[PDB]
Amino acid sequence: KSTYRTPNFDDVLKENNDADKGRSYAYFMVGAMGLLSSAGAK
């Protein structure tokens, strides 16, 4: 098996990448954690 044949990631990849959707969802969740951390630190 060559080193150019990438193994199977297809069970764990997104069916649609759409690089603003995924980054917006991730930054929304990180921002929610930062929101509640700011409230708790206050």
Partner 1 sequence: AEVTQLSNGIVVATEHNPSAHTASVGVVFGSGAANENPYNNGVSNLWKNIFLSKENSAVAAKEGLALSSNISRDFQSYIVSSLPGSTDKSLDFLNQSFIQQKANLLSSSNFEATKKSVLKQVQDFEENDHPNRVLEHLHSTAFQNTPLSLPTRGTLESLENLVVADLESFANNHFLNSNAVVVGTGNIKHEDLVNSIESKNLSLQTGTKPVLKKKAAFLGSEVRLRDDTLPKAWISLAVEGEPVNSPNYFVAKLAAQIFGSYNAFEPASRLQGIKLLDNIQEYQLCDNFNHFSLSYKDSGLWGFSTATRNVTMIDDLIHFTLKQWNRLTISVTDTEVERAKSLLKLQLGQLYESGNPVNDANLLGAEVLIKGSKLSLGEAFKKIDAITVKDVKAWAGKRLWDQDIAIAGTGQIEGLLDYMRIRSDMSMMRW
Ligand X SMILES: CCCCCCCCCCCCCCCC(=O)OC[C@H](COP(=O)([O-])OCC[N+](C)(C)C)OC(=O)CCCCCCCCCCCCCCC
Provide the binding-site residues for partner 1, judged by CB under 8 A. 1-6, 9-10, 17, 19, 23
Instruction: Note whether 35 binds ligand 6PH by CB under 6 A.
Output: no
Place of tokens 């297809």: 10
CB of residue 15 vs ligand 6PH: minimum separation in angstroms? Answer: 25
Task: From 5, 26, 22, select the one nearest 14 (Cα to Cα).
Answer: 22
Q: What is the Cα–Cα distance from 33 to 42, expressed in whole angstroms?
A: 14
Cβ proximity of 22 and 14 under 8 Å: yes
CB of residue 24 vs ligand 6PH: minimum separation in angstroms? Answer: 16
The correct pick among 21, 24, 27, 32 for binding ligand X (CB under 6 A) is: 27
